[PDB]
Structures are given as structure tokens and as C-alpha cells.
């Protein structure tokens, strides 16, 4: 189930077997944190995330936080905006353009460079069981 602790150790574990996300993500270093934005409704009600410690094309944790999360760049969104998204029925690149997916914290010009890397992890995302 997406944005449970099981999702997100099963990510981390996908990104690592990606050859794709691997060369795209050679020289990226920071953590990134996907967060959904609180929804009562949606059986979260303070907000939750998955925080990737990702490095050098692999990632070296990640972990499901109930609430707010801290990270070098932090992309939030509403559930539903997400469930588009990881599911392939949003592309990523024009959602954050459009601030459907918002970003928190760190700079388009900082992550710009590396929207081949951001395509990638949201293919692998798609994957995962």
C-alpha cells in the first residue's frame, strides 16, 4: 500500500535493482522526501511521507513518517494528486511545474539538472507492489 513502512523499504529496495535510475542518478546526493498533505478521510490524519536517503544512484534508506518529514528537498501533495503520479496517470515533470506537486523545500534550479532522475524515480515508484 503506498506510503506504508512496507512501500517504502520496497522502493528503496526497487531504486537499488534500477540500472535506469542508477545512471540517471550518478551524481545526485541529498535525501528527498515525498509527503502527502493531511487527509482525515484517507487514514492520515497528520500527513505522511516517505523520506529516501539516496546517494550516487543507489538508496541507502528509506522510511514512512507519520506527520512532517525532514529532507534536502521535500515535494508535497494532496493523496490523490500522489496515487495519480505513482500510477502513471500524472506525469511528474509538468505536476511540479504546475505546483500539483509542490515543492516544500530546495530550489527548481538546484533539481532542474536532474529531471532525468526524478522521470526514473517515479517509473520505479510505478513498480513497486
Partial sequence: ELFTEAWAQAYCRKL???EAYRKAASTWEGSLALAVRPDPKAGFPKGVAVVLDLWHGAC???????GEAEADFVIEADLAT???????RLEPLSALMRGLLELKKGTIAALAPY???AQELVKVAREVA
Fill in 60 to 66: 541507502r534508506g528509506a522510511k514512512a513518517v507519520e
Fill in 82 to 88: 500522489w496515487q495519480e503520479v505513482l500510477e502513471g
Fill in 115 to 117: 529531471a532525468q532522475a
Fill in 16 to 18: 537499488n535493482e534500477s
